[PDB]
Amino acid sequence: LALRDVAARQLANATKTVPQLRTITPRWLVRLLHWTPVEAGIYRVN
Amino acid sequence: LALRDVAARQLANATKTVPQLRTITPRWLVRLLHWTPVEAGIYRVNQVKDAFVDYIDNPREYLLSAVNTVVDVHTRISDLYSNPHDQIREQLRLTIEIMKERQESELINSREYGLLNNVAPGQLVHTRNGAPTPDDLDELLIRVWKEPAFFLAHPQAIAAFGRECTRRGVPPATVSLFGSSFITWRGVPLIPSDKVPLENGKTKILLLRVGESRQGVVGLYQPNLPGEQGMGLSVRFMGINRKALASYLVSLYCSLAVLTDDALAVLDNVDVTQYHTYRY
Amino acid sequence: TPDDLDELLIRVWKEPAFFLAHPQAIAAFGRECTRRGVPPATVSLFGSSFITWRGVPLIPSDKVPLENGKTKILLLRVGESRQGVVGLYQPNLPGEQGMGLSVRFMGINRKALASYLVSLYCSLAVLTDDALAVLDNVDVTQYHTYRY
Amino acid sequence: QVKDAFVDYIDNPREYLLSAVNTVVDVHTRISDL
Amino acid sequence: LALRDVAARQLANATKTVPQLRTITPRWLVRLLHWTPVEAGIYRVN
Amino acid sequence: QVKDAFVDYIDNPREYLLSAVNTVVDVHTRISDL
Amino acid sequence: MGINRKALASYLVSLYCSLAVLTDDALAVLDNVDVTQYHTYRY
Tell me the three state secondary structure of residue A21: coil
Instruction: Write the CB contacts of B223 (distance below 8 Å, at least 6 apart in sequence).
Output: B37, B38, B39
Per the CB < 8 A criterion, the answer to whether C132 and C75 are in contact is yes
Say which of A9, A20, A26 has its CB closest to residue B45.
A20
Per the CB < 8 A criterion, the answer to whether B127 and B269 are in contact is yes
Instruction: Write the CB contacts of B23 (distance below 8 Å, at least 6 apart in sequence).
Output: B97, B98, B101, D5
d(CA B278, CA B163): 12
User: Do β-strands B34-37 and A15-16 pair in parallel, antiparallel, or remain unpaired?
Assistant: unpaired
Experimental method: cryo-EM
According to DSSP, residue D33 is labeled: H
* Cα B112–Cα B116–Cα B121 angle in degrees, nearest 5: 100
Among residues B208, B196, B204, B197, the alpha carbon closest in space to that of B132 is found at B204
Check if E11 contacts D (Cβ < 8 Å).
yes
DSSP H or E stretch at residue G2: strand G2-3
Tell me the three state secondary structure of residue B265: strand
Q: Which residues of E touch G22 (CB under 8 A)?
A: 45
d(CA C121, CA C95): 13
Task: Determine whether the interchain pair C15/B180 forms a contact, defined as Cβ–Cβ distance below 8 Å.
Answer: yes
d(CA D4, CA B25): 16
Task: Determine whether the interchain pair B174/C15 forms a contact, defined as Cβ–Cβ distance below 8 Å.
Answer: no
Crossing angle of helices C2-11 and C23-35, in 10° steps, is: 120
User: Using a CB cutoff of 8 Å and minimum separation of 24, what contacts does D28-33 make?
Assistant: D28/C112, D28/C113, D28/C114, D29/C108, D29/C112, D29/C113, D29/C114, D30/C112, D32/C114
d(CA F19, CA B73): 17
d(CA B244, CA B239): 9
Instruction: Write the CB contacts of G19 (distance below 8 Å, at least 6 apart in sequence).
Output: E33
Q: Please give the single-letter amino acid code of residue B182.
A: F
* b/e map E2-33, b = 16+ CB within 10 Å: bbbeebbebbeeeeeeebeeeeeeeeeeeeee
d(CA C102, CA D22): 10
Check if B55 contacts C (Cβ < 8 Å).
no
What is B55-90 written as a DSSP string?
B-SS-EEEEPEEEEEEEEEEHHHHHHS-SBS-HHHH
Per the CB < 8 A criterion, the answer to whether D8 and B26 are in contact is no
Neighbour count for residue B160 (Cβ, 10 Å): 27
d(CA B107, CA B30): 8
What is B107-162 written as a DSSP string?
HHH-SSS-TTTS--TTSEEE-SSSS--HHHHHHHHHHT-S---EEEE-HHHHHHHH
C-alpha distances in Å from residue B261, one per residue of B258, C49, C60, F4: 7, 47, 49, 82
Q: Please give the single-letter amino acid code of residue B191.
A: I
Instruction: Write the CB contacts of B200 (distance below 8 Å, at least 6 apart in sequence).
Output: none
Report the residue of chain C nearest G7, measured CA to CA: C117
C-alpha distances in Å from residue E39, one per residue of B111, B142, G15: 96, 103, 15
DSSP H or E stretch at residue E27: none
Check if A26 contacts B (Cβ < 8 Å).
yes
Task: Determine whether the interchain pair C117/D20 forms a contact, defined as Cβ–Cβ distance below 8 Å.
Answer: no
What is chain C written as a DSSP string?
-HHHHHHHHHHT-S---EEEE-HHHHHHHHHHHHHTT----EEEETTEEEEEETTEEEEE-TTS--SSS-EEEEEE-B-TTTT-EEEE-----SS--BTTEEEEEEEE-TT-EEEEEEEEEEEEEESSGGGEEEEEEE-----PPP--
Among residues B102, B95, B101, the alpha carbon closest in space to that of B71 is found at B95
Q: Which residues of G touch E43 (CB under 8 A)?
A: 18, 20
Say which of F5, F7, F15 has its CB closest to residue E22.
F5
Per the CB < 8 A criterion, the answer to whether B208 and B263 are in contact is yes
Check if E20 contacts F (Cβ < 8 Å).
yes
Top residue of C108, C116, C127 to mutate, by most chain D CBs within 10 Å, is C116
Phi first, then psi, for residue B63 (nearest 5°) are -100, 125
Per the CB < 8 A criterion, the answer to whether C46 and C38 are in contact is no
Per the CB < 8 A criterion, the answer to whether F27 and B22 are in contact is no
Tell me the three state secondary structure of residue D28: strand
DSSP H or E stretch at residue B96: helix B87-109
Check if B74 contacts E (Cβ < 8 Å).
yes
Report the residue of chain B nearest F15, measured CA to CA: B10
DSSP H or E stretch at residue E17: none
Phi first, then psi, for residue B192 (nearest 5°) are -85, 145
Q: Please give the single-letter amino acid code of residue B102.
A: R
Tell me the three state secondary structure of residue B103: helix
Give the number of residues written for chain C. 148
Per the CB < 8 A criterion, the answer to whether B265 and B147 are in contact is no
* Partner chains of F (3+ C-beta pairs under 8 Å): B, E
Per the CB < 8 A criterion, the answer to whether C7 and C57 are in contact is no
Among residues B210, B245, B191, the alpha carbon closest in space to that of B35 is found at B210
DSSP H or E stretch at residue E18: none
Q: Which residues of D touch E7 (CB under 8 A)?
A: 3, 8-11
Among residues B135, B87, B110, the alpha carbon closest in space to that of B248 is found at B87
Sign, CA torsion G26/G27/G28/G33: positive
Crossing angle of helices B155-167 and C2-11, in 10° steps, is: 170
Residues forming beta bridges with residue B61, ordered by sequence position: B44
Check if D4 contacts E (Cβ < 8 Å).
no
According to DSSP, residue G25 is labeled: G
d(CA B249, CA B53): 48
Check if G10 contacts C (Cβ < 8 Å).
no
* Cis status, amide bond into B84, omega within 30 of 0: yes
Per the CB < 8 A criterion, the answer to whether C32 and C1 are in contact is yes
